[PDB]
Write a protein that binds this ligand. Structure first.
Ligand SMILES: N[C@@H](CCC(=O)O)C(=O)O
Ligand SMILES: N[C@@H](CCC(=O)O)C(=O)O
Ligand SMILES: [Br-]
Ligand SMILES: [Br-]
Lengths: 262, 262
């Protein structure tokens, strides 16, 4: 069959995908910049396809409704055939691996704690043993599922608190979670992946920090519909780009070369 | 077809696979202990197979002879059908992914530098810009291939030195490389994966240390022959064990609960 345009689903998540400054006057793929935008171009080059970047319609990574069993987010766009590939900071998880294909990981990370500077919190155990400082996670993502499923004493205690906290401690986007840390004068801490935490730590106004070690160890992968013929070539491209040092170069470009806090 | 015993290829590499103290009086799988021995039992349980642990015949991880194109080590045992699965600290690489199947990674790591304490070396750049202190890597492994293929200025310079150094700076086993660091009074440094470096740093006589950051970022995966029906179930088992915290528990058990340097 003749080549067709590969539909790429992704998510507005800094520094992976961001609107360029002049984006209102730009169109198509040129509206966007970031780590995943650069990565998409590299994957397309090595695999030999043309592509269109599209921002996921519901703004979500992907979770399965416990009642209706329907997948939302970027995972849903792959499951229902609305996109051909997802190039995003999409965490490789068991429940997702059962319904979509993943490349080997292009980035390693773990769940981490973001505080406003000066907050008297050093660890998840600290958060779990107090109630003055609220804390939460992103909706429809792997971090929330981590706490929902954990049998580790500290993390189960944190989940029991978060699921019933009022007002809600869950946010719709990472940016909302970060904004809540910044505006809460230290009374809200945010549970997010170390990649995004470390990025924000280097962005103005330089008022947040990552505390403690990571709570787990996992990776982001490029996702394709289960059984898609594109997955094999995409996986080999990730491995080649990793071994050539390109992924390290892109991490340095978007996290630290552009750091704003010194 | 009726179930048959799964032949597991692995390698004597501490703390992944080690001879038990009384091993001369033990037989079968009971001769061995370590992270990979525990992991094998967990994978077998979740996938529902019986298995026999076998130590790779040539003691190697796996490389392809540039002339004869033949694979040695554990990769060769899978390629030629002498083993059904490899449960070992086997690095996921492009050239291996082309000939065998890999699970998603069960451990993350990077290449690192081991010195005898007091050696005046802090980085790969330091090693590359001097000649008093020799340095080398393991034969037939992914670290040697890393330096052989690198186009990064510092690492290419190090390869050009290592490939022609006399006497040879390459070793046959990790243990030989560690012993050479310890006996060379600081005149040999060893390039090895951070996992093994960090383990040795916590073992008697506590005379080595890991210096500098990791040179790359990658992972170990469970390997199966290409197209093997076992790979799918093995991959889901790794992800479940990761998410249940078992891999973290096993890392703590074999690296740090058993640390000997404080
Ligand atoms: N990377 C996560 C989203 C962010 C988070 O959950 O912290 C996912 O794929 O669901
Ligand atoms: N894990 C490596 C062996 C150790 C090394 O090369 O440093 C491999 O799979 O080849
Ligand atoms: Br992973
Ligand atoms: Br990997």
């Amino acid at each position: 069959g003749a080549n067709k345009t590969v539909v790429v689903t992704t998510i507005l998540e800094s520094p992976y995908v961001m609107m360029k400054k002049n984006h209102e006057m730009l169109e198509g793929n040129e509206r966007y910049e970031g780590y995943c935008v650069d990565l998409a171009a590299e994957i397309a080059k090595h695999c030999g396809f043309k592509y269109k970047l599209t921002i996921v319609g519901d703004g979500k990574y992907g979770a399965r409704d416990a009642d209706t069993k329907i997948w939302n987010g970027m995972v849903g766009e792959l499951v229902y055939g609305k996109a051909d590939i997802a190039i995003a900071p999409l965490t490789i998880t068991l429940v997702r691996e059962e319904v979509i294909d993943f490349s080997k990981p292009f980035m390693s990370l773990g769940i981490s704690i973001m505080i406003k500077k000066g907050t008297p919190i050093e660890s998840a155990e600290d958060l779990s043993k107090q109630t003055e400082i609220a804390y939460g996670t992103l909706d429809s993502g792997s971090t929330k599922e981590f706490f929902r499923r954990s049998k580790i004493a500290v993390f189960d205690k944190m989940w029991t608190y978060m699921r019933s906290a009022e007002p809600s401690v869950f946010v719709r986007t990472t940016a909302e979670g970060v904004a809540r840390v910044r505006k809460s004068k230290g009374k809200y801490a945010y549970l997010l992946e170390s990649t995004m935490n470390e990025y924000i730590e280097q962005r103005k106004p330089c008022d947040t920090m990552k505390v403690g070690g990571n709570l787990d160890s996992k990776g982001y992968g490029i996702a394709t519909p289960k059984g898609s013929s594109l997955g094999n070539a995409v996986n080999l491209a990730v491995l080649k780009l990793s071994e050539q040092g390109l992924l390290d170069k892109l991490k340095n470009k978007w996290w630290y070369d552009k750091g704003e806090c010194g």
